[PDB]
Amino acid sequence: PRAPRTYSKTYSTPKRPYESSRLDAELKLAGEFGLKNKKEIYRISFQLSKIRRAARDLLTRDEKDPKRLFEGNALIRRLVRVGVLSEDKKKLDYVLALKVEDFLERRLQTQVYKLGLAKSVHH
Amino acid sequence: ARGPKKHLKRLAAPHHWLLDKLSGCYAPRPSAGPHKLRESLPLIVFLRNRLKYALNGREVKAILMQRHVKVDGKVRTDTTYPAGFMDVITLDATNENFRLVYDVKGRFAVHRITDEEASYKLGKVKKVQLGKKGVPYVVTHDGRTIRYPDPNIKVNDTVKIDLASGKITDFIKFDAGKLVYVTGGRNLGRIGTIVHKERHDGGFDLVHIKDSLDNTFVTRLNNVFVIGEQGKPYISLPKGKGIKLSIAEERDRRRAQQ
Amino acid sequence: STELTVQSERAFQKQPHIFNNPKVKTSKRTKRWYKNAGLGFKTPKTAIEGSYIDKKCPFTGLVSIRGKILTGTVVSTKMHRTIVIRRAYLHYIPKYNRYEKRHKNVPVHVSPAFRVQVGDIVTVGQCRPISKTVRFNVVKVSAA
Amino acid sequence: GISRDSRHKRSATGAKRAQFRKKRKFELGRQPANTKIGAKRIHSVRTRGGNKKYRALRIETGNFSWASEGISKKTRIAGVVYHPSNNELVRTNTLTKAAIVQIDATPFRQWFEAHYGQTLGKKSKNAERKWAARAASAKIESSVESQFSAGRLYACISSRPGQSGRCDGYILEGEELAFYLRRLTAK
RNA sequence: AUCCGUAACUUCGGGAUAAGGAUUGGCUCUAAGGGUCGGGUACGAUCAACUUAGAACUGGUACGGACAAGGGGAAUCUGACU
RNA sequence: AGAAUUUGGACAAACUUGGUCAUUUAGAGGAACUAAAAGUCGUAACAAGGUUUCCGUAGGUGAACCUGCGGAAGGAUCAUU
RNA sequence: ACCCACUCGGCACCUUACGAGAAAUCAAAGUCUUUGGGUUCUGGGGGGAGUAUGGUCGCAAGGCUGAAACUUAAAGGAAUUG
RNA sequence: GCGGUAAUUCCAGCUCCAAUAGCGUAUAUUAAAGUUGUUGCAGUUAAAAAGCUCGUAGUUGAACUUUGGGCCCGGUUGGCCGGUCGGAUUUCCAACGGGGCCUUUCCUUCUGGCUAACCUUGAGCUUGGCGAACCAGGACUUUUACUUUGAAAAAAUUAGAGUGUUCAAAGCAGGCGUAUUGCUCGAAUAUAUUAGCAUGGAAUAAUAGAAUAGGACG
RNA sequence: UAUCUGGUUGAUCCUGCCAGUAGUCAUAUGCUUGUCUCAAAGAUUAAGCCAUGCAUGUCUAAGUAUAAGCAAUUUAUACAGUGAAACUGCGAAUGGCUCAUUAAAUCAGUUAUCGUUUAUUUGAUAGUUCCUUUACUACAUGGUAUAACUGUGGUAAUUCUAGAGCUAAUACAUGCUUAAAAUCUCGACCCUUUGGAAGAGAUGUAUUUAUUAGAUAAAAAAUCAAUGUCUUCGGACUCUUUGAUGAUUCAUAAUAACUUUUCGAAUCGCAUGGCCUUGUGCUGGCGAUGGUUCAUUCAAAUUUCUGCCCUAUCAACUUUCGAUGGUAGGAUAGUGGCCUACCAUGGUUUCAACGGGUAACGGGGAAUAAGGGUUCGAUUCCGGAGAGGGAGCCUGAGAAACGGCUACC
Ligand SMILES: [Mg+2]
Ligand SMILES: [Mg+2]
Ligand SMILES: [Mg+2]
Ligand SMILES: [Mg+2]
Ligand SMILES: [Mg+2]
Ligand SMILES: [Mg+2]
Ligand SMILES: [Mg+2]
Ligand SMILES: [Mg+2]
Ligand SMILES: [Mg+2]
Ligand SMILES: [Mg+2]
Ligand SMILES: [Mg+2]
Ligand SMILES: [Mg+2]
Ligand SMILES: [Mg+2]
Ligand SMILES: [Mg+2]
Ligand SMILES: [Mg+2]
Ligand SMILES: [Mg+2]
Ligand SMILES: [Mg+2]
Ligand SMILES: [Mg+2]
Ligand SMILES: [Mg+2]
Ligand SMILES: [Mg+2]
Ligand SMILES: [Mg+2]
Ligand SMILES: [Mg+2]
Ligand SMILES: [Mg+2]
Ligand SMILES: [Mg+2]
Ligand SMILES: [Mg+2]
Ligand SMILES: [Mg+2]
Ligand SMILES: [Mg+2]
Ligand SMILES: [Mg+2]
């Protein structure tokens, strides 16, 4: 007896295993950003799905609703902090419309690549 | 089963103690005392978790066993003495005096006070009865029996006790316009100046309350504790003064001062 | 009711500790104890002036009303000082988002203060256990 | 042992309840005393909370109250003449609450003669003053005065001897007395 | 004799006392079950029945104490039955 | 004060004997179903399938099936002012 | 008794499809993914199977109620050209 | 479905593909499954409308009773102005929601006090109207369903705010100074059916009332 | 992240299933396996059986110490450091394990106890007890065992124990000492009529019974039955005492007695001080332990309302000897057919009773979910139940206890 540790999984496998379009897009992302796994892309899609679910649950509400204001401003702030969302886009619809690449461009790997220092994402 | 329970598992302790769900399988079970178990700070938690004057239970026992700390003027060399609302905890070393009093979030606050204010506490009378030989007595929320009171002291009133003798110095009656402290429920910690009460002969008197910001709410009379008139209270109030800022305003202030 | 020849039992029926001294003698047929049961229920004239005893009556007897106040309709008057009321209610089923009629049957003790017929609406109050199944007492009738 | 529970015998519908919860002591019951007369023999029972309970067997005397006069006296119990629940307790002279019994009446005769003066059946100035002030209060009743001829007063046990150890009671008066006399002398 | 309990099958009427079990004495009591008279234009008095049920107590656990008084069950052949 | 022993009572394990319910299970032989198999006998249905099919019921026949009574068109007729 | 016009209520019929439908076809089989007028009954791949067993009705014939094992990838509807 | 002497399907080699420190198989369960159908199935022919009618547990059940118009008060949004240096006021056109009053509208009151807001007016802030706006206690008092609000619904879990576990799963920590003596923000919030409790509304749907007047007022 | 694809045909559109597809704090198994953090784990079948070893004991300044134990006090000649053993007191009823039983039962939430017990805490709270109570008494304090210990032994053996000799207590077990005053009774005697008395006894708390008070929305008059407190005896009359609950026969108090008679300190440490008529004189502090009642807390027991899976090839069930109810009693900590006596004939049921099944402990919750939902929930928290099966019971506040006894299998 002791309080259990909480745990969650951070990725979701897609329903259709063999879809050539999705496979091509996934491998293009992996080659552009230096990844060893489709699990990384699945993880980013999982995070983005959670964010989008939250934004939909808020947008169904009324504006000036305190829950909407609080949680939406918090989400927007938390994304603007990591730069996944520009300070031009702070209306909670661009949140829904973001991308996977917007998250994937903020990884320290590609950020190193941008800030010199590596001249390749694998390096 | 078969008798009283002597253990208390974590995740069954009250949440307002703020005990880590980790850091053990058990929690301190408050000993039998003047306060209910679900309403009790006890001293181990007060000294280790809130004040950080100790890092273990061994150190708390060490502190208590050299008689530095006293509750309501008495020493209480017990690790699980249930200290509760309005209890006065005096540490002659450090020359400190605390009054157990709720913050607005629903937890107990580290409310330091002066020695002249630690010479008294407030008590909510629960029943006025006739004892043996015709002696009337009042019972408070801390199990204090006080004989020969003023005949006008009725139930749901508040009483000023001198804490050296167990004598009464003054009393506040329950009436509209009186300042209340909420002790129990969702509105726990608020302070809001009664406007009127609702009777319901048969069960559970209710009472309406309105904060300084004119925010109204409703509670049961068992969760209410008059502490003076509007304006002047009879005690020192903690920071916030029972206003219950919304989460938005809370973050606004936390950003105003950062 | 029917007034049922008050001293029909083998023991003498009296209110406990209600003593009518034979030395002094006045009117007031017999010192009769009654109480206001509370909660705005009127103590009936039949109970104040009657001669029945009813240990379990909430006006002249040693029981109290505390807890729930229920309401029902009488479907049986065949027991002695005991009836059965039907409590009809509607139970919600969330899957179908609509209700179904449900009923409970509640046995309750009825004082001779009241004469109840099948069909009468009554309101009853929770008392201590009166029998294996009875925990409620009639305290007002709401029909004729 | 004896169980005082309800998870045995059937529900109100008529259903037989399954065996739940082996017998518990907080629902215990114990054997009756069946209190008889003569030669005091009281055994103590240790009950829940400590709380001694005095189980009377073979009890002889009792404190019996005369309420019209406002007194109580200790007397011997002669025998049981009526019980409303069972005639076998009468046959066995078994004492229980609500038992009608006969008692000695001599302390009551003595008290009446020393308090009112006159007599029952058939000196100093202080005493005559007492007895004259306590006049128009000594014409009690016909039936009790007739009982005093035999010195066997009908009383009702008001105590629970198997619970407290006492056979206390009150002398019958008025309509209670008429009721029990009609129940007795009828034949 | 009283109480309990009674299957297959069946022409639904039976089978059936199915099968299979308990009790039964003596004594002292208790309860219930009735008739005839009575009331200005609820009951009281009186008289007499063997029927049932029950409780104590009692005995060398005996008691339909002699007499009296069915053995039963599962199946077949055969004739319907009296 | 008080042990052994002991009267009666309630609580009552356990055993025996019956009864009852359920679940598994054997069984001569009998009667079906399913499949397999290039088996035997025919050819009942699909066309007007060579007597138009089918329903209900009853009888009969190696087997499909046949026949009688009534019904249906899912008919081979939407049709004779 | 006929004719004309009208009307209520019926048995039906012709034409069209706004609509419906897998289609054959349908003034209801329409007003149904723009999904809710009220209400009862029945079905959930094909066989085994309306079988076995148990009840209940019936003189019987049989009726009503009614499985499982096991087996199987198709059975089936409406249309199309041969 | 492949395999019967040219196997893209078997046994292997080569190459290739998918997930990858994980991948496969079995069983069960969820979605897919609108193949359980309240949302939301089907019923002429594909499985399925009882042979037909009547009828008791149930389900469902026509319309109707205060509408309309006015006068005020003060809230939330807006809007020039920005009279502040991308923050706000107040006098403003309008919309949005509340309360009160009058239109035949008692929209329960009996006894009393604060008499309240008071014809109370003392010369421009004073000596004296009507009971709830503050309480007491009472006469009583149609019954439900429904919905709003609130309390209540242990903690953990769930969603979710903040925050260095080096990221993350997590955890409820931690952060800031002259770090010599110390200061300080937190540990939120929401959900939590049905039943019960109180509360506002009073449409919708039921229920009752004065008809051989033992009816209301007084 | 509201997605579908292959298979009936010569081909088409359908109905319809089969197959595929994704997930599983859902198990197993196969192959493979380098690192960091976190971490479940004999539940499923056998609540089947268990070798061995551990899991409940425990002390301070402050109950009892001549250890023939260790020390050294050296303040000690009664003890007065530490301290095994044993007595006493507390605890062992918590915890932990499991899910066999259990389908209105458990359980959830919501109620109640004006229906009761409650060790411990916490706070208040006994001047009343010498019994012919004027020698009856120890109250600067009374008595008896007994353990450990010494020694003699029994048995193969057990946490077995006998006989003999000592000795203690907060053990057992008795038992005194503290006001005054008022009120009631009896009442000698004086004696009067207006009638008064000395003296004796009782008066705590607890138990049992009977009785009484525990009240009241408002205002005045008539006379008497007797005058009532004081009289300017016309009659001035007031003062008069009454708490709480929605509600009580409540709290509480008062009379009469009752009890085999409860409690009311024969206890302990530290400090040792003040007043004198200098006696081992009188007073006196901080604590510990114990104790009656009340309240409080930790609980417990019972309890209101509503809510649980499949099954009609279970439709009638309950009621002999308890089913439903009434009166009374017994029992209980208390309510109550909980049990008994007498009496009545009730109670549940197509709104699914009763019976059967569950590969059923219940919830909080988990998986998967556009929405609605389906399935799971032995398992970290809450409640319940059990200790191989049954039953019974001692001790205690608390157990129908099982790392406690008794019996049967
Ligand atoms: Mg336990
Ligand atoms: Mg503790
Ligand atoms: Mg043909
Ligand atoms: Mg026509
Ligand atoms: Mg026609
Ligand atoms: Mg299907
Ligand atoms: Mg089928
Ligand atoms: Mg292949
Ligand atoms: Mg190959
Ligand atoms: Mg779906
Ligand atoms: Mg379908
Ligand atoms: Mg067909
Ligand atoms: Mg068909
Ligand atoms: Mg038809
Ligand atoms: Mg209707
Ligand atoms: Mg409701
Ligand atoms: Mg086909
Ligand atoms: Mg083909
Ligand atoms: Mg599949
Ligand atoms: Mg105490
Ligand atoms: Mg009773
Ligand atoms: Mg009874
Ligand atoms: Mg089970
Ligand atoms: Mg299991
Ligand atoms: Mg147990
Ligand atoms: Mg075992
Ligand atoms: Mg046991
Ligand atoms: Mg064990």
Description:
Helices cover 52% and strands 0% of the residues of chain A. Chain A is built from 5 helices and no strands. In chain A, helix 2 packs antiparallel against helix 3 (66-82). Chain B has helices spanning 43-50, 57-65, 247-256, and strands at residues 69-71, 88-91, 96-99, 101-102, 108-109, 121-124, 127-130, 136-139, 145-147, 158-161, 168-172, 178-182, 196-198, 206-210, 216-220, 224-229. In chain B, the strands form 6 sheets. Chain B has a 3-stranded antiparallel β-sheet, with no helix packed on it. In chain B, strands 6-10-11 form a 3-stranded antiparallel β-sheet, with no helix packed on it. In chain B, strands 7-8-9 form a 3-stranded antiparallel β-sheet, with no helix packed on it. In chain B, strand 14 (206-210) and strand 15 (216-220) form a beta hairpin. Chain D has 187 residues and is of the alpha+beta class. Chain D contains 6 helices and 9 strands. Chain D is elongated and about 80 Å long. Residues 29, 31, 80 of chain B line the site of one magnesium ion (MG). Chain D binds 5 RNA strands through strand 1, strand 2, strand 3, strand 4 and strand 5.
Biggest interface: C-D, 14 and 17 residues
Shape annotation of chain C: elongated
Oligomeric state: part of a larger assembly
Task: Give the amount of beta strand of chain D, in percent.
Answer: 25-35%
CA-CA gap between termini of chain C: 14 Å
Q: Which structural class matches the secondary elements of chain D?
A: alpha+beta
Bound molecules: magnesium ion
What is the gyration radius of chain C calculated from CA atoms? Answer: 18 Å
Q: How big is the Rg of chain D?
A: 22 Å
Helices of chain C, by number, come to: 1
Main beta sheet of chain C: strand number and arrangement? Answer: 5 strands, mixed, barrel
**What portion of residues of chain D is helical?**
25-40%
Distance between the termini of chain D: 43 Å
**Strand ordering within the main sheet of chain C:** 1-2-3-5-4
Counted by DSSP, the helix tally of chain D is: 6
Strand adjacency order, main sheet of chain D: 5-6-7-8-9
PDB class: translation
Keywords: stalling dicodon codon pair, translation
Entry title: Structure of yeast 80S ribosome stalled on the CGA-CCG inhibitory codon combination.
Chain A: 40S ribosomal protein S9-A
